């Protein structure tokens, strides 16, 4: 009856993201927010709403969860990066977070976000000091040429996962110095599950130039086995 | 420095599929195939290889796992379908299974397979009986308008998950008769997770045409609340 | 009261078997079969019925569950047995299954079922091509003498668990050839549990003639640690 | 070789019971008993032997585990039974436990065990005070009906599982008074798995005479849903 | 044998805190920090060190774990407190965090720590902007009187848990305005476990003045059922 | 209202013990005691009450759970101790138990209990045979000095945890002989979590005098890695 002349959107677009880049607080449905203390023991114990992607940072959605934030905090504190690069931006929450966190730490850090599509970015123009947004394209490597001009140390973070190994070869040869991080969030465990032989070969090809950092690599489900850095040349 | 001269295939292409459409028997790494019986108790208890998609049917890879296979066995025995349609073929294992199973049940069933790329299908020529392949895109409703007429009852299976709700729409107005299935494997639970609001509106738009068949919808992790059918 | 009336069957007779050897599909008792799509998310998430042995093959009950079926399929495809023997028949579901699967693979296989009690066999006589039943007592080795006439490779399957180790001893001495399987379903983990010393001694006495096939021994809970085959002398 | 030297006993005889009715203390195989304290963190953290039936009472094996022991303790304290009956004996560990436990609690209680085979009973002749052994067949009610006029309250325990629904009918009419227990240990969950319809129908038949004691029925896995008592 | 030479500090002093108020980075103990990529699949998958209280903020230990930090983040953003009070200080790590997180948010917030022992504090005098440390006793209630004269909204956090119920009475009667929070961290699940009736009675006494806030109360294991506020 | 005119006990007093040293049977709250057998399958499958310390012994509260009781039984059966010392008494439940058990075993055993506060003891003097009680602080070694000559073999059990290592040193030097046990219930795993470095130093300082009995050390969650005795290697 109601499926009539409707163009149904492709729900695959909202994968790992959600419907809305803007942040809205969770709302309770099956209980009152103000539970009475005389009935305190009868109150339900579950969260009350979806824990899909519930985190925020100053009113922007944060796709990086608390355990991941904790790892990056330690990494920032130890490395004191002059440059953090995000390939894959979405709403920009994690950019502002990296910027904020580096400011509180007293680290002179320029944060850079690269994406094919920047139209979902929720960072207001007034809150953009030391955050630069570049419109790029993973399959074209000359995109990345800009900002070999940038300062070190440097953390390069892949959240896009398109031409990753090629981008890695570029970064190793043209960008990273010893100590710099190249990080692949989320995807490495899935590539190993689906393509165990090719994955092991491809990662293994970078063994003279990149190490898995074992202090951080097992510390969150999002960074699981994906934290690499440049070994001594 | 092997990264310097090396062709990096795009690894996302294998998502949900594997790296090779042809079947290869599992290989044991950290044990012998023959475990000595006087040390029986000290044998490892784990599988010995990855359980990603280790299933086969007659030398062809099978991406439908044993409990999914059992559900379809029951469905095919109840419904006695004269057509089965697979949106998404890959190596063709499931096509060959559906055809073999219906034949062994005594059921005259045509199996139809639709895919963007049929260059991966592994079904030997010598047994393509009652299988019809079609090459086409899912983002194109034209791929379905071109289909010739099919017998009933019918089962339509979505293993491709592109433009799925528009295809459901086309299927309800131009294909499905009362008692015919439209099954979305795998994806329903993810779509609810990622886009609960829109998923809900979309599914509920079919409230007067499709229902969820609770006999089968909770019977396997792959078919999990995705087995629908046409009600009067 | 209702109890003074009844006769009360021995419920131990249905151990591992169920009440009725004939197949009837599951039925939903506490929800509609057709759940409305506007309330999809409210739908109950559990199976809906008993998960004991709700399995079938062409309207006969299947006591071997899906994972077990998957192991036998790989085993049949690799080995291509000329003979499969089921010690312990019940309804014949696995007999019909084995025969159907070998026909589909183009294998010339004679399926043989041995039991003291053949009265629960549900296979129609019109559908007994390449299946043979045979009456016999497990403790009487005469029961198995006609097996020596059969072609190989051979898979011998114990679903009876009476006199098992003497039957194994006999199979090694008079029946089994290199490559043939001797398989004990279900019982071996229990025998190890209740009598670890005698069980380890008994199994280990076959160390020169049989081995545990580790490609199949861990692949199903029913076949768990019970898949054995004849090694080379 | 060795399989031909062997006289193979039937291992189904040992089901639920173990190989030897006499108690032997567990032994470590892959560690020293005395772990050096300077490598305390290196010590393995598993049990170190099989937990099939590791329990004992005063040198006799105990087939009832600590969780079950604790329920029977509370039940004895509340009910203060003059008689505890055990259908099925084995080594008599639980018979001696029931006796010793009622003695320290000050309860005057005769313990009676009944079995087809009493030759496995490990209880010393000179430690058999307030314990009676009775030979008899379960699928045959002459065993039960003759030996009677036992004092109340009463606890009747099934550890045999032979003709249980008929023994239950005999007990409600000719033995049990209000507040007495009839307990089926272990077997209730299996009869429900294998015969849901026949089992629900049979227990439902006793609806006006027995009930499930909910204070004790969920409190151990052996007693799981098998604690019944005589409500009038 | 140097048990008779050794001097034993009270290990109870470190319960829930650790040996050292100063932060030190985790030490890797049975693996290299740099795992070679040709052996990537063979790298161990566990953390590499103890997950006891491994967290930090800007070189200071953080006893509030990331899940709890996420809850307080939302709370600060929503409430926008002018005052945050921590009953129990230790190293000052969460004092510094609260202050930093409110500056970042553009909120004008004074942060206050109260403990009988402030000598474990690790915050340099360099950066005590909007942080005040007060010498306090949980048994004395004159201790808390300085808090009355300062701005709301207000979050009051008990990390000390001595004479808590009297402090909640004082706070309700003399401090908390509508909107303001009283948060007991960690202990409520334990008090209810050990003292269900007395705890239910005691919490029950605040039914007209405080309510449990279900948005934040189940969102972390440290705040579990302990987030209360002056409302209703 | 009720809060402002209510006297609040310090709830930390009850940590690890409960509100009442006297035993009260559990009580069903949301179901009838007697469930009807026509609705047997529809019966709830959980305990129906709180499992904090539901355990008793002859009308006295038991804080040691059944698993711990089974270990101590085996310990008593093998060691056949003449003395059993409990540091920590609370209600005396365990004292009455140890005494009863040794008596039923034929073991002539004196049970000693030590606590700063004996006022919660619930054991009737009518059954106080072979039970001695002392009043004293643990933080004072004098409490252990004033103890008389005790018979061996011996089990010394710590349930108080106040100055455990100096008490251990006093035990080893002045009390324990070949075979005697020193057991620390509950606390060892917490000291190891909160202070791994200082705990490993202190325990390993007894490496010549005490050793962890592996037959019992892993046999219960309460006695976990805390069962020590004066034996070599």
């Amino acid at each position: 009856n109601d499926y009539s002349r409707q163009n149904f959107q492709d729900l695959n677009l909202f994968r790992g993201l959600g419907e809305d880049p803007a942040y809205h607080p969770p709302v309770l449905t099956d209980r009152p927010r103000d539970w009475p203390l005389d009935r305190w023991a009868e109150a339900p114990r579950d969260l009350g709403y979806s824990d899909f992607s519930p985190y925020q940072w100053r009113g922007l959605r944060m796709l990086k969860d608390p355990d991941t934030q904790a790892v990056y905090h330690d990494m920032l504190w130890e490395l004191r990066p002059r440059t953090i690069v995000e390939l894959g931006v979405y709403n920009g929450g994690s950019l502002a977070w990296f910027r904020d966190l580096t400011k509180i730490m007293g680290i002179d850090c320029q944060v850079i976000g690269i994406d094919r599509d920047l139209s979902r970015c929720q960072i207001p123009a007034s809150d953009m000091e030391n955050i630069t947004l570049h419109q790029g394209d993973c399959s074209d490597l000359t995109t990345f040429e800009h900002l070999r001009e940038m300062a070190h140390p440097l953390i390069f973070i892949d959240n896009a996962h398109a031409n990753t190994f090629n981008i890695m070869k570029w970064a190793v040869d043209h960008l990273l110095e010893e100590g710099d991080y190249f990080i692949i969030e989320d995807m490495i465990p899935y590539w190993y599950r689906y393509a165990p032989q090719l994955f092991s070969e491809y990662l293994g090809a970078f063994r003279d130039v990149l190490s898995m950092d074992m202090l951080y690599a097992n510390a969150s489900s999002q960074l699981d086995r994906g934290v690499l850095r440049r070994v001594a040349a």
Side-chain angles (χ1 to χ4, degrees), chain A residues 71 74 78 181 212-219:
Chain A
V71 166
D74 296 338
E78 167 185 39
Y181 278 86
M212 181 162 52
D213 185 350
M214 297 305 280
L215 193 59
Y216 300 126
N218 303 321

mmCIF file of all heavy atoms in Angstrom, chain A residues 71 74 78 181 212-219:
data_model
loop_
_atom_site.group_PDB
_atom_site.id
_atom_site.type_symbol
_atom_site.label_atom_id
_atom_site.label_comp_id
_atom_site.label_asym_id
_atom_site.label_seq_id
_atom_site.Cartn_x
_atom_site.Cartn_y
_atom_site.Cartn_z
ATOM 1 N N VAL A 71 43.697 5.368 23.898
ATOM 2 C CA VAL A 71 44.918 5.001 23.204
ATOM 3 C C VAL A 71 45.540 6.228 22.511
ATOM 4 O O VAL A 71 46.711 6.521 22.727
ATOM 5 C CB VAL A 71 44.657 3.868 22.188
ATOM 6 C CG1 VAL A 71 45.833 3.716 21.233
ATOM 7 C CG2 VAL A 71 44.361 2.568 22.912
ATOM 8 N N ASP A 74 47.259 8.645 24.959
ATOM 9 C CA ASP A 74 48.600 8.174 25.334
ATOM 10 C C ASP A 74 49.600 8.391 24.203
ATOM 11 O O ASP A 74 50.705 8.830 24.435
ATOM 12 C CB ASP A 74 48.590 6.684 25.724
ATOM 13 C CG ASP A 74 47.754 6.391 26.985
ATOM 14 O OD1 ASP A 74 47.529 7.335 27.778
ATOM 15 O OD2 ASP A 74 47.270 5.247 27.248
ATOM 16 N N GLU A 78 52.909 10.840 24.359
ATOM 17 C CA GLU A 78 54.246 10.284 24.183
ATOM 18 C C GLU A 78 54.972 10.862 22.945
ATOM 19 O O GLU A 78 56.121 11.274 23.031
ATOM 20 C CB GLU A 78 54.147 8.760 24.082
ATOM 21 C CG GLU A 78 55.407 8.041 23.588
ATOM 22 C CD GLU A 78 55.169 6.550 23.407
ATOM 23 O OE1 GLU A 78 54.071 6.153 22.943
ATOM 24 O OE2 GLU A 78 56.070 5.763 23.741
ATOM 25 N N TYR A 181 53.534 7.533 12.693
ATOM 26 C CA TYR A 181 52.575 6.449 12.728
ATOM 27 C C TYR A 181 51.770 6.385 11.433
ATOM 28 O O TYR A 181 51.451 7.402 10.837
ATOM 29 C CB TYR A 181 51.651 6.623 13.931
ATOM 30 C CG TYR A 181 52.253 6.115 15.226
ATOM 31 C CD1 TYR A 181 53.066 6.921 16.008
ATOM 32 C CD2 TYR A 181 52.018 4.819 15.658
ATOM 33 C CE1 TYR A 181 53.617 6.445 17.192
ATOM 34 C CE2 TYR A 181 52.565 4.346 16.837
ATOM 35 C CZ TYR A 181 53.357 5.160 17.596
ATOM 36 O OH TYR A 181 53.903 4.671 18.754
ATOM 37 N N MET A 212 54.483 -3.211 13.726
ATOM 38 C CA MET A 212 53.269 -3.099 14.525
ATOM 39 C C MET A 212 53.660 -2.726 15.955
ATOM 40 O O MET A 212 54.412 -3.452 16.608
ATOM 41 C CB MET A 212 52.483 -4.402 14.529
ATOM 42 C CG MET A 212 51.197 -4.311 15.321
ATOM 43 S SD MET A 212 50.035 -5.609 14.926
ATOM 44 C CE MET A 212 51.068 -7.057 15.135
ATOM 45 N N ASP A 213 53.146 -1.594 16.434
ATOM 46 C CA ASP A 213 53.453 -1.100 17.763
ATOM 47 C C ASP A 213 52.600 -1.814 18.801
ATOM 48 O O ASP A 213 51.425 -1.543 18.935
ATOM 49 C CB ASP A 213 53.202 0.400 17.826
ATOM 50 C CG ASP A 213 53.614 1.005 19.151
ATOM 51 O OD1 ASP A 213 53.910 0.255 20.096
ATOM 52 O OD2 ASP A 213 53.672 2.228 19.343
ATOM 53 N N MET A 214 53.217 -2.696 19.569
ATOM 54 C CA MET A 214 52.484 -3.593 20.449
ATOM 55 C C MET A 214 51.989 -2.963 21.734
ATOM 56 O O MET A 214 51.187 -3.579 22.428
ATOM 57 C CB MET A 214 53.341 -4.801 20.788
ATOM 58 C CG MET A 214 53.683 -5.641 19.593
ATOM 59 S SD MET A 214 52.267 -6.205 18.656
ATOM 60 C CE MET A 214 51.751 -7.597 19.701
ATOM 61 N N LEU A 215 52.455 -1.760 22.062
ATOM 62 C CA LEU A 215 51.893 -1.020 23.192
ATOM 63 C C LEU A 215 50.460 -0.555 22.920
ATOM 64 O O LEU A 215 49.622 -0.544 23.828
ATOM 65 C CB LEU A 215 52.760 0.188 23.546
ATOM 66 C CG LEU A 215 52.445 0.860 24.894
ATOM 67 C CD1 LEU A 215 52.605 -0.103 26.039
ATOM 68 C CD2 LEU A 215 53.345 2.076 25.116
ATOM 69 N N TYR A 216 50.184 -0.186 21.673
ATOM 70 C CA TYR A 216 48.875 0.343 21.290
ATOM 71 C C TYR A 216 48.005 -0.631 20.487
ATOM 72 O O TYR A 216 46.788 -0.572 20.569
ATOM 73 C CB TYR A 216 49.069 1.635 20.507
ATOM 74 C CG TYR A 216 49.798 2.707 21.289
ATOM 75 C CD1 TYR A 216 50.929 3.327 20.780
ATOM 76 C CD2 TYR A 216 49.353 3.100 22.552
ATOM 77 C CE1 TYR A 216 51.600 4.315 21.505
ATOM 78 C CE2 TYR A 216 50.013 4.092 23.283
ATOM 79 C CZ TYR A 216 51.128 4.695 22.752
ATOM 80 O OH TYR A 216 51.773 5.671 23.477
ATOM 81 N N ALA A 217 48.630 -1.528 19.739
ATOM 82 C CA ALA A 217 47.936 -2.395 18.791
ATOM 83 C C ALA A 217 46.857 -3.304 19.388
ATOM 84 O O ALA A 217 45.903 -3.618 18.710
ATOM 85 C CB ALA A 217 48.958 -3.256 18.013
ATOM 86 N N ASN A 218 46.998 -3.756 20.625
ATOM 87 C CA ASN A 218 45.934 -4.579 21.238
ATOM 88 C C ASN A 218 45.042 -3.801 22.222
ATOM 89 O O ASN A 218 44.285 -4.389 22.967
ATOM 90 C CB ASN A 218 46.535 -5.821 21.914
ATOM 91 C CG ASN A 218 47.357 -6.680 20.947
ATOM 92 O OD1 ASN A 218 46.991 -6.858 19.782
ATOM 93 N ND2 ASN A 218 48.477 -7.205 21.427
ATOM 94 N N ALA A 219 45.102 -2.477 22.213
ATOM 95 C CA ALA A 219 44.463 -1.693 23.282
ATOM 96 C C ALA A 219 43.028 -1.232 22.994
ATOM 97 O O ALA A 219 42.349 -0.772 23.891
ATOM 98 C CB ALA A 219 45.343 -0.501 23.651
#
